[PDB]
Design a protein around this ligand. Structure first.
Ligand SMILES: Nc1nc2c(c(=O)[nH]1)N[C@H]1C(S)=C(S)[C@@H](COP(=O)(O)OP(=O)(O)OC[C@H]3O[C@@H](n4cnc5c(=O)[nH]c(N)nc54)[C@H](O)[C@@H]3O)O[C@H]1N2
Ligand SMILES: Nc1nc2c(c(=O)[nH]1)N[C@H]1C(S)=C(S)[C@@H](COP(=O)(O)OP(=O)(O)OC[C@H]3O[C@@H](n4cnc5c(=O)[nH]c(N)nc54)[C@H](O)[C@@H]3O)O[C@H]1N2
Ligand SMILES: OC[C@H]1O[C@@H](O)[C@H](O)[C@@H](O)[C@@H]1O
Ligand SMILES: OC[C@H]1O[C@@H](O)[C@H](O)[C@@H](O)[C@@H]1O
Ligand SMILES: OC[C@H]1O[C@@H](O)[C@H](O)[C@@H](O)[C@@H]1O
Ligand SMILES: [Mo+6]
Ligand SMILES: [O]
Ligand SMILES: [O]
Length: 767
């Protein structure tokens, strides 16, 4: 066809131009306040050299199945097969594992960002089919807030991280000092889990125009600091809890803390104060004590603390600091500091844990909620914390602790992954490669030839959202509209929707009608729309017929009371009438429930503990902290294998931001090929020399595609730059068992070996 088609994605709403059946541009939505620069890469991902054309089976698995040499996964030897051959093999394997081992034999957690959409949700569709086969082992939590989402319920009485924030207009009108703590909102609000509304950009523009003072506490001077002209304060990475303690000690010793707020809204302050002063352990937590750990001058620490109580202050914290050893302590100590400041529940005061994620603070509309397809049970134990996947494979039947409970790891034999990239997202790549040999069968379903697809036994080519129809909400927190995600182009090559793949597997198991319910694509979509219309009718919100909605492509909802929302205002007004969901009904600075667990690595009040490895730590073996943060010009690993890579690759490798003093000490110049290494692994990167990163730290973003020099050699050099070749794979503590992906020390040198060639962005042989 020829014309324009409106649809959406994790980067926003867009208008595609189609010529002779091929999409030629993904243009920004006219109503978007800040369109994404990544749209050209989203378009290219439909057509790039790494688009998966056909079903494939690795040669060793096609010939020997369960008896294959497991060490050769990832060596490139794939055989093209027909869809019938691939689907029959997958169905035979699903049935074999269920009959031999029961539900504990299959792992169906399949963590990953996939694509938005209420119908074409690849993970829910996979679980719908696996439940019809007999069941599976799931995963709990995520890689984003694994620690904060477990400690917050014990402290504030709610998960806190994925909840609406005090509205942006209220912050602009009332806040005197905005503190971005381990957060880069100008970078991270580009993405949404549903289709993003980019509402944070409207709020940040209003904040900039008013001239309000901004401070960001971060090892890197970011686009957020440049936009606002912010003061940048850079503690050594992993020392924020010590900095917060020094600030708290200053407030207490100078009688600047809010005694009334502490008495009326919290429990355990007296016990915490005994720790703060050193009465309980012999070590006063002074600004000088804190300065020695974090590297900032003691007077700067005292001045920051005094400035937080001088006017109305908002502590807007990000999540990198909890994606680390003892991560639970970061936001627990932040809430304790906010309680001493005493402004929780006031307009523009307190703290917020989602101003940097999916446009939190964009005012909530009066529209209805939109539902989608279910798993028939998205957005040994029968479930594991997600980042314990390798520990599980290495210790079948072994015990593990999690948030007060004791359980044993299930004995998993088959793993099915759809819409995720664990060979980019999981920690300690070399350890993971050896552990994966414990799986009998590994099936991967995607549209791009990621490191995960390259390591599979069986590869099934899915379609993108642009090759089918769907329905989804716009604005993770605002719910400003419902959008028709219309088909842009017909399915490419031999690709099939995840729905069509799972329906064909359900048919082979004799459960076809149970999977489909006799509905077709538009039948499912209209059912979801009609349920939203009924909910809206009960709340006096007008909506068009399904036919008129589909023709127009969108329905917008108005904002009224959502513009005035203040988080914790009811609790502050009357804590006895509106108690929190904690044992006391108050903020738990001291937790008796956590005391009873007896976990050495997660005490009963916020506490400073040395991490496994850190910059400035006694016995540290490597010199530089690696800031393994989220990428500017990708969504994780998404879009690495597209023309968008040209915006940032350095000599064909992932970029490494390095301070001029650390570079000059090693004879490194901008543009040089470098080797980054530690005792766990080694990778290549390209140098980007800049004083934006503090001395003692280097920045290498997560998501790079792993490209082994010699796949048959243990510890081989990664030719491209997957930062998770350098990371450690351990739990945050026994409380949350979260990942520690930003706890990394390494050295760097000018590469001195023979020239190598990156091949991970090329079409695999035979594909
Ligand atoms: N373009 C883009 N946007 C995204 C994503 C993406 O991949 N690309 N991913 C999405 C997802 S799933 C999430 S969870 C969010 C990510 O949200 P976050 O986890 O908050 O983001 P990060 O980029 O990992 O880190 C935030 C900031 O913390 C700083 N930092 C790192 N270590 C420390 C430390 O020890 N102390 C202090 N004070 N600061 C530190 C970093 O320099 C960075 O500027 O972004 C979302 N949006
Ligand atoms: N060192 C370090 N490691 C980190 C982090 C960090 O800060 N530091 N960040 C962590 C976090 S919070 C996250 S969320 C993870 C990110 O890990 P992931 O979510 O696994 O990363 P993505 O690259 O988004 O992978 C999603 C995959 O889904 C595929 N896909 C998209 N839509 C569909 C669909 O409809 N069908 C199918 N079959 N496939 C589809 C995409 O092409 C892509 O390959 O990384 C984690 N790892
Ligand atoms: O070529 C015909 C085949 O096309 C595939 O896209 C359909 O999934 C399958 O059901 C059909 O038989
Ligand atoms: O067809 C494209 C148009 O569709 C409308 O429904 C959207 O509100 C408008 O912003 C967009 O330009
Ligand atoms: O010492 C026990 C701890 O050991 C760590 O290696 C594991 O990652 C963690 O799950 C466990 O609680
Ligand atoms: Mo995440
Ligand atoms: O995550
Ligand atoms: O995430």
């Amino acid at each position: 066809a020829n014309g324009e088609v409106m649809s959406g994605c994790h980067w926003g709403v867009f208008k595609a131009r189609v010529e002779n059946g091929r999409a030629v541009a993904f243009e920004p939505w006219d109503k978007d306040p800040a369109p994404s620069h990544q749209l050209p890469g989203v378009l290219d991902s439909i057509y790039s050299p790494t688009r998966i054309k056909y079903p494939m089976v690795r040669r060793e698995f096609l010939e020997k199945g369960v008896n294959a040499d497991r060490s050769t996964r990832g060596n490139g030897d794939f055989v093209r097969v027909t869809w019938d051959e691939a689907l029959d093999l997958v169905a035979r394997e699903l049935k074999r594992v269920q009959e031999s081992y029961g539900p504990t034999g299959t792992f169906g957690g399949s963590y990953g960002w996939k694509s938005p959409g209420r119908l074409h949700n690849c993970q829910v569709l996979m679980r719908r089919a696996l439940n019809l086969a007999g069941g599976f082992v799931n995963s709990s939590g995520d890689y984003s807030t694994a620690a904060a989402q477990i400690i917050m319920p014990h402290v504030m009485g709610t998960l806190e991280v994925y909840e609406q924030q005090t509205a942006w207009p209220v912050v602009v009108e009332n806040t005197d000092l905005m503190v971005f703590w381990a957060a880069d909102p100008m970078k991270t609000n580009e993405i949404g889990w549903v289709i993003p509304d980019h509402g944070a950009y409207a709020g940040m523009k209003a904040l900039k125009e008013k001239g309000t003072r901004v401070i960001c506490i971060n090892p890197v001077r970011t686009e957020t600091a440049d936009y606002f002209g912010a003061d940048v304060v850079s503690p050594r990475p992993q020392t924020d809890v010590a900095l917060m303690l020094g600030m708290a000690h200053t407030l207490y010793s100078e009688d600047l803390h809010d005694k009334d707020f502490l008495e009326n809204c919290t429990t355990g302050f007296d016990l915490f104060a005994a720790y703060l002063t050193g009465e309980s352990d012999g070590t006063p937590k002074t600004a000088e004590w804190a300065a020695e750990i974090c590297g900032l001058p003691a007077e700067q620490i005292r001045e920051l603390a005094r400035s937080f109580v001088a006017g109305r202050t908002m502590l807007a914290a990000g999540w990198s600091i909890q994606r680390m050893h003892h991560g639970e302590q970061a936001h627990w100590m932040l809430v304790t500091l906010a309680s001493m400041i005493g402004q929780i529940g006031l307009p523009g005061g307190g703290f917020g844990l989602s101003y940097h994620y999916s446009n939190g603070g964009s005012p909530t509309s009066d529209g209805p909620a939109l539902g989608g397809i279910s798993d028939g049970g998205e957005g040994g134990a029968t479930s594991i914390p997600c980042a314990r996947v390798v520990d599980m494979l290495l210790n079948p039947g072994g015990e593990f602790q999690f948030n007060g409970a004791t359980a044993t790891y299930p004995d998993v034999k088959l793993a099915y992954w759809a819409g995720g990239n664990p060979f980019a997202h999981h920690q300690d790549r070399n350890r993971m490669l050896k552990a994966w040999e414990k799986l009998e069968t590994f099936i991967v379903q995607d549209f791009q030839w990621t490191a995960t697809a390259r390591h599979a036994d069986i590869v099934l080519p899915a379609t993108t959202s642009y090759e089918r129809n769907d329905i989804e909400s716009v604005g993770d927190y605002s719910n400003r509209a419902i959008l028709a995600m219309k088909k842009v182009v017909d399915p490419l090559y031999e690709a099939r929707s995840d729905y069509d793949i799972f329906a064909a597997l359900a048919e082979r198991l004799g459960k076809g009608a149970e999977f489909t319910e006799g509905r077709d694509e538009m039948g499912w979509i209209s059912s979801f729309y009609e349920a939203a219309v009924k909910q809206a009718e009960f709340k006096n919100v007008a909506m068009p017929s399904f036919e008129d909605f589909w023709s127009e492509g969108i329905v917008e909802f108005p904002i009224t009371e959502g513009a005035n929302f203040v988080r914790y205002a009811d609790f502050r007004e009357d804590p006895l009438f509106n108690p929190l969901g904690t044992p006391s009904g108050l903020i738990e600075i001291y937790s008796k429930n956590i005391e009873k667990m007896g976990y050495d690595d997660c005490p009963a009040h916020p506490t400073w503990m040395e991490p496994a490895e850190r910059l400035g730590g006694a016995g540290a073996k490597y010199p530089l902290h690696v800031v393994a943060s989220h990428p500017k010009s990708r969504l994780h690993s998404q879009l690495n294998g597209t023309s968008l890579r040209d915006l940032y690759a350095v000599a064909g490798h992932e970029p490494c931001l390095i301070n001029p003093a650390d570079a000059a000490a090693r004879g490194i110049a901008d543009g040089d090929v470098l080797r980054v290494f530690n005792d766990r692994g080694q990778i290549l990167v390209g140098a980007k020399v800049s004083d934006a990163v503090m001395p003692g730290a280097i920045q290498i973003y997560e998501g790079g595609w792993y490209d082994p020099l010699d796949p048959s050699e243990e510890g081989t050099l990664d030719k491209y730059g997957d930062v998770n070749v350098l990371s450690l794979d351990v739990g945050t503590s026994k409380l949350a068992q979260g990942n520690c992906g930003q706890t990394i020390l390494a050295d760097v040198e000018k590469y001195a070996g023979a020239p190598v060639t990156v091949t991970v962005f090329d079409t695999p042989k035979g594909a």
